[PDB]
Amino acid sequence: SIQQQATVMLKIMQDYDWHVFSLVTTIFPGYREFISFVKTTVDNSFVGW
Amino acid sequence: TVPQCCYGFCIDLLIKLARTMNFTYEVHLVADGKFGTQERVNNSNKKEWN
Numbered sequence: 711s712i713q714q715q716a717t718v719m720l721k722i723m724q725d726y727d728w729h730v731f732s733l734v735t736t737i738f739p740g741y742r743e744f745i746s747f748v749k750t751t752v753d754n755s756f757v758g759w
Numbered sequence: 760t761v762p763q764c765c766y767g768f769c770i771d772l773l774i775k776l777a778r779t780m781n782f783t784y785e786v787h788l789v790a791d792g793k794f795g796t797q798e799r800v801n802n803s804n805k806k807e808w809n
């Protein structure tokens with residue numbers, strides 16, 4: 711699903727030392743969950759980059 | 760969770776605040792017995808304090 715693919719992409723960003731990123735999304739209805747998940751992971755700061 | 764008798768500077772300040780702002784004090788000790796900060800635990804996915 712989108713949730714686990716997002717985690718894999720965030721692990722890829724952890725690798726290669728990529729810390730700054732921008733979100734570009736379409737009006738596709740199936741990506742509001744993606745935006746919410748990315749925002750929640752950004753709010754998660756106890757671990758990770 | 761037996762009731763103890765804790766007192767000192769902080770309780771005096773709390774009593775002053777309660778008298779000045781109509782507060783009621785229900786002092787209870789922290790279960791963890793520590794100040795509590797950010798730390799990593801099992802299933803490290805959510806950000807939480809202790």
Ligand SMILES: *[C@@H]1O[C@H](CO)[C@@H](O)[C@H](O)[C@H]1NC(C)=O
Nearest residue numbers: 776777778779780781782783
């Ligand atoms: C809190 O401050 C406001 C503004 O000064 C005051 O009107 C109010 O009475 C205060 N609260 C108490 C419990 O006194």
Ligand SMILES: *[C@@H]1O[C@H](CO)[C@@H](O)[C@H](O)[C@H]1NC(C)=O
Nearest residue numbers: 776777778779780781782783
């Ligand atoms: C505290 O409560 C009593 C009764 O409820 C009231 O008469 C008194 O004015 C209150 N104190 C303040 C600072 O508002």
